[PDB]
Scaffold this active site. Structure first.
Site, PDB file in Angstrom:
ATOM      1  N   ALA A 121       0.823  -1.206   0.000  1.00 19.04           N
ATOM      2  CA  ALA A 121       0.000   0.000   0.000  1.00 19.04           C
ATOM      3  C   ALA A 121       0.857   1.256   0.000  1.00 19.04           C
ATOM      4  O   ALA A 121       0.514   2.257  -0.644  1.00 19.04           O
ATOM      5  CB  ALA A 121      -0.933   0.001   1.213  1.00 19.04           C
ATOM      6  N   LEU A 122       1.969   1.228   0.724  1.00 20.27           N
ATOM      7  CA  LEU A 122       2.893   2.347   0.654  1.00 20.27           C
ATOM      8  C   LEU A 122       3.462   2.502  -0.753  1.00 20.27           C
ATOM      9  O   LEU A 122       3.520   3.614  -1.292  1.00 20.27           O
ATOM     10  CB  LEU A 122       4.012   2.153   1.667  1.00 20.27           C
ATOM     11  CG  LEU A 122       5.056   3.260   1.646  1.00 20.27           C
ATOM     12  CD1 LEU A 122       4.474   4.503   2.272  1.00 20.27           C
ATOM     13  CD2 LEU A 122       6.296   2.791   2.389  1.00 20.27           C
ATOM     14  N   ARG A 320     -11.998  -0.025  -1.934  1.00 18.31           N
ATOM     15  CA  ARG A 320     -13.042  -0.934  -2.372  1.00 18.31           C
ATOM     16  C   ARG A 320     -13.587  -1.654  -1.133  1.00 18.31           C
ATOM     17  O   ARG A 320     -12.895  -2.469  -0.513  1.00 18.31           O
ATOM     18  CB  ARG A 320     -12.528  -1.888  -3.467  1.00 18.31           C
ATOM     19  CG  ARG A 320     -13.627  -2.798  -3.982  1.00 18.31           C
ATOM     20  CD  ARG A 320     -13.321  -3.485  -5.294  1.00 18.31           C
ATOM     21  NE  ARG A 320     -12.183  -4.390  -5.209  1.00 18.31           N
ATOM     22  CZ  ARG A 320     -11.816  -5.235  -6.177  1.00 18.31           C
ATOM     23  NH1 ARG A 320     -12.514  -5.296  -7.303  1.00 18.31           N
ATOM     24  NH2 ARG A 320     -10.749  -6.013  -6.020  1.00 18.31           N
ATOM     25  N   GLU A 412     -19.419  -6.130 -13.146  1.00 15.18           N
ATOM     26  CA  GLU A 412     -18.876  -7.474 -13.010  1.00 15.18           C
ATOM     27  C   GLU A 412     -19.953  -8.496 -12.669  1.00 15.18           C
ATOM     28  O   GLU A 412     -19.622  -9.622 -12.290  1.00 15.18           O
ATOM     29  CB  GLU A 412     -17.772  -7.545 -11.966  1.00 15.18           C
ATOM     30  CG  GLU A 412     -18.100  -6.960 -10.568  1.00 15.18           C
ATOM     31  CD  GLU A 412     -16.849  -6.950  -9.702  1.00 15.18           C
ATOM     32  OE1 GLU A 412     -15.731  -7.057 -10.275  1.00 15.18           O
ATOM     33  OE2 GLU A 412     -16.948  -6.792  -8.487  1.00 15.18           O
ATOM     34  N   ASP A 440     -14.533 -11.503 -12.521  1.00 17.73           N
ATOM     35  CA  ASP A 440     -15.812 -11.627 -11.815  1.00 17.73           C
ATOM     36  C   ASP A 440     -16.952 -11.782 -12.805  1.00 17.73           C
ATOM     37  O   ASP A 440     -17.860 -12.602 -12.601  1.00 17.73           O
ATOM     38  CB  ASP A 440     -16.069 -10.403 -10.927  1.00 17.73           C
ATOM     39  CG  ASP A 440     -15.728 -10.655  -9.451  1.00 17.73           C
ATOM     40  OD1 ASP A 440     -15.972 -11.786  -8.979  1.00 17.73           O
ATOM     41  OD2 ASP A 440     -15.197  -9.728  -8.788  1.00 17.73           O
ATOM     42  N   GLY A 593      -4.666 -13.040   0.601  1.00 17.87           N
ATOM     43  CA  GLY A 593      -5.720 -12.980  -0.391  1.00 17.87           C
ATOM     44  C   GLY A 593      -5.310 -12.805  -1.841  1.00 17.87           C
ATOM     45  O   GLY A 593      -6.195 -12.795  -2.702  1.00 17.87           O
ATOM     46  N   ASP A 608      -6.651 -13.889  -7.505  1.00 20.42           N
ATOM     47  CA  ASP A 608      -7.481 -13.293  -6.467  1.00 20.42           C
ATOM     48  C   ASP A 608      -8.762 -14.118  -6.416  1.00 20.42           C
ATOM     49  O   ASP A 608      -8.808 -15.233  -6.948  1.00 20.42           O
ATOM     50  CB  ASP A 608      -7.703 -11.800  -6.750  1.00 20.42           C
ATOM     51  CG  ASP A 608      -8.901 -11.530  -7.662  1.00 20.42           C
ATOM     52  OD1 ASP A 608      -9.136 -12.293  -8.645  1.00 20.42           O
ATOM     53  OD2 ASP A 608      -9.593 -10.518  -7.400  1.00 20.42           O
TER      54      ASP A 608
END
Ligand SMILES: O=C(O)/C(O)=C/C(=O)c1ccc(O)cc1Br
Ligand SMILES: [Mg+2]
Ligand SMILES: [Mg+2]
Length: 699
Positions: A121-122, A320, A412, A440, A593, A608
């Site tokens: 995330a950084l 999300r 999706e 999806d 995940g 994923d």
């Protein structure tokens, strides 16, 4: 009990303490009215949340028994009959306002990382600016043939091909009036416009307006900023450096604006099954909105001489949430029912994002005062209406103006694809993008037509008629609603993290289809995908398409049924059971995940929950029509379970003890009962098994 009592809720202590000690301080919301809103909103909205979930099961149940009798004329009429296919509204335009320019105007890559992984995330919020030299040298875009292969020390043969590649990019993006950046021997700006020195001549930009600014003295700029298609290019001029000492214009590097927006993810790339998991997430998301996330830091904005100006330095962030399906026992009610995780994400991720609106953490997120939430896995317009009303209620609890929370509608699910115009109308004053979630989307197409017949192979879906209409039908709908200069038209993800040569080659198709943006796996892949938006003029492509309805209903409803030898089958099932296994071990055993699992062909695919939804749905379909058997599936399961372990410290094997692995036995469930999950979703079985593994490991 450890849980804390508030109205009819029992909030897990760790969540309760996190919100009070870390989240609420700063937002000027009184912790007692906040929890009062939480208890109130949950009690208010859980009914029709659950009502909508029943409508999925009901509409689906009609479809299943239809195909065990019954050819699109009877079909289409029957779907609009049962409320699946709904009428199309009048043409309209979205009214969403106060949106950052990153979303209304700029076209360019969109990155997604798991929010539970802080250093990822950084890197993702830091990925708004990326070195082009490192992405060219670091990957297979430059072939590792001849004497240009990456080694343990820097290779100069490879190094000059990087430079020559980037020199060409400069030629095809910011043209000189006469000549080539490859023969460039100097840069300077004299009297407001940049003069590039050549051997014999001195020329400037064919469009001198693409000059944006520079660092250093205008005599000897330490860099020069360039713009094209709204995307910024920095050339760092420092001949001191190793690379600088060799380059014939002292150039050290070419930096591209890469990750225009990033999507911090709470859904398909994360494992979060109890109140402890969600709080690592929530704490990371809070760390980002404050601007004090560290592990090191978020980088600051960048300053330039035009006087002085300054540009964003971090990628604008979305989050999300999860969709409407799952519950999570981080909160339970009085008789013990787990509370809907979608409502929790909206309240908690919303409250947190107030910090990303002020500076007193230091770093701001939205400069126009908006909070950007992606809502995955919606099934129709009425599910969009509900998400809207849900956000409107969270706004009251949190005291911010109405419509601060904006939607990222995920195309999706099949029932939103054919009612897409109804969906965007539903969110018409909050939507900030639509995006073809094609993985999806493929899992729904299989599970929706599960009783129709054997499905075509997984690879073949990439070219099926339904999918192609679906991709163009979305761009159509977006432009017809006013998305140009208002909201992103977005497309899906490149999963192959080692094939940047192919990505650079083929991903150009997405912006050429009118995509404002497309999804990336990495800060590196983001930089390379940015090359595609200097080639294609997304804004010009969008105007060549307005009105042009290149898709009808019947092309969207064409079901990818088949019509194979015993090599093409044994290769499919083994391929499938390998990417299912390899994702699920890291998922059930370690709460990871998202993992790169090589498929059968030694291709590192980034998996994923969408990709696993396709794989497990697929075998499930081939089982229900007797293409193969349960014991054949178990065979490939056991055939590959040794192979992922060698493909994989502190890790748990799977063979020979297949009974005593919660991960192996989960994958087996995901296929063999695959058909009986609501809409083929994989969260139930994964969430029950993840919690199971934890329970054993605590004894
Ligand atoms: O097309 C979808 O279903 C969509 O929403 C994208 C994903 O969820 C996704 C898929 C694979 C991957 O490696 C990472 C991700 Br973020
Ligand atoms: Mg998706
Ligand atoms: Mg152009």
């Amino acid at each position: 009990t450890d849980r804390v009592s508030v109205g009819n809720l029992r909030i897990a202590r760790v969540l309760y303490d996190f919100v009070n000690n870390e989240a609420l301080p700063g937002t000027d919301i009184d912790p007692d009215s906040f929890w009062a809103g939480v208890d109130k909103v949950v009690a208010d909205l859980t009914p029709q949340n659950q009502a909508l979930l029943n409508a999925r099961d009901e509409l689906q149940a009609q479809i299943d028994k239809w195909h065990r009798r019954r050819d699109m004329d009877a079909y289409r009429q029957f779907l609009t009959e049962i409320g699946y296919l709904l009428p199309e509204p009048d043409d309209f335009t979205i009214t969403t306002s106060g949106v950052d320019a990153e979303i209304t105007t700029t076209a360019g890559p969109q990155l997604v990382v798991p929010v539970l992984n802080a250093r990822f995330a950084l890197n993702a919020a830091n990925a708004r600016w990326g070195s082009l030299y490192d992405a060219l040298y670091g990957t297979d875009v430059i072939p590792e043939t001849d004497g240009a292969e990456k080694g343990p020390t820097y290779n100069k043969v490879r190094g000059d091909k990087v430079i020559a590649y980037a020199r060409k990019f400069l030629d095809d993006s910011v043209p000189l009036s006469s000549g080539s950046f490859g023969d460039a021997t100097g840069f300077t700006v004299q009297d407001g416009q940049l003069v590039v020195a050549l051997p014999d001549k001195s020329t400037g930009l064919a469009n001198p307006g693409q000059f944006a600014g520079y660092t250093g003295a205008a005599e000897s700029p330490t860099s020069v900023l360039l713009i094209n298609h709204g995307l910024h290019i920095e050339i760092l001029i420092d001949p001191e450096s190793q690379v600088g000492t060799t380059d014939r214009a002292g150039v050290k590097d070419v930096i591209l604006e890469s990750a225009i927006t990033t999507i911090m993810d709470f859904e398909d790339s994360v494992a979060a099954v109890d109140a402890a998991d969600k709080v690592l997430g929530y704490r990371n998301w809070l760390g980002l909105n404050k601007g004090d996330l560290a592990a090191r830091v978020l980088n600051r904005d960048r300053n330039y001489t035009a006087g002085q100006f300054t540009l964003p330095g971090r990628s604008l962030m979305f989050v999300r949430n999860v969709g409407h399906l799952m519950t999570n026992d981080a909160i339970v009610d009085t008789d013990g029912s787990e509370v809907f995780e979608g409502i929790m994400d909206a309240l908690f991720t919303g409250l947190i994002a107030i910090h990303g609106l002020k500076a007193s953490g230091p770093l701001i997120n939205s400069r126009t005062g908006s909070i950007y939430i992606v809502k995955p896995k919606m099934h129709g317009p009425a599910e969009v209406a509900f998400t809207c009303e849900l956000f409107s209620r969270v706004e009251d609890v949190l005291g911010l103006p109405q419509n601060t929370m904006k939607i990222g509608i995920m195309d999706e699910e099949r029932r939103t694809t054919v009612n897409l115009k109804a969906c965007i109308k539903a969110a018409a004053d909050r939507v900030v993008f639509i995006n073809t979630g094609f993985l999806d989307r493929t899992g729904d197409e299989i599970h929706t037509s599960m009783e129709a017949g054997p499905m075509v192979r997984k690879g073949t879906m990439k070219s099926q008629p339904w999918i192609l209409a679906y991709e163009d039908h979305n761009v159509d709908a977006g432009l017809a609603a006013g998305f140009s200069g208002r909201a992103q038209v977005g497309k899906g993800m490149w999963t192959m993290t080692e094939l940047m040569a192919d990505m650079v080659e083929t991903k150009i198709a997405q912006p050429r289809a009118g995509a404002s943006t497309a999804w990336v796996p990495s800060p590196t892949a983001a930089t390379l995908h940015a090359l595609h938006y200097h080639q294609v003029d997304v804004a010009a492509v969008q105007q060549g398409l307005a009105g042009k309805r290149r898709a009808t209903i019947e092309q969207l409803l064409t079901i990818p049924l088949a019509k194979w030898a015993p090599d093409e089958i044994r290769e499919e099932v083994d391929n499938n059971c390998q990417s299912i296994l390899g994702y699920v071990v890291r998922w059930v055993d370690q709460g990871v995940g998202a993992s790169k699992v090589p498929d059968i062909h030694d291709v590192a695919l980034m998996e994923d929950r969408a990709t696993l939804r396709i794989s497990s749905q697929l075998l499930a379909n081939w089982l229900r029509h007797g293409v193969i058997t349960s014991a054949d599936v178990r065979a490939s399961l056991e055939r590959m379970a040794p192979l992922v372990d060698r493909q994989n410290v502190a890790y748990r094997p799977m063979a020979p003890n297949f009974d005593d692995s919660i991960a192996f036995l989960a994958a087996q469930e995901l296929i063999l009962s695959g058909a009986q999950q609501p809409n083929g979703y994989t969260e139930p079985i994964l969430h029950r098994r993840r919690r199971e593994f934890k329970a054993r490991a605590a004894e």
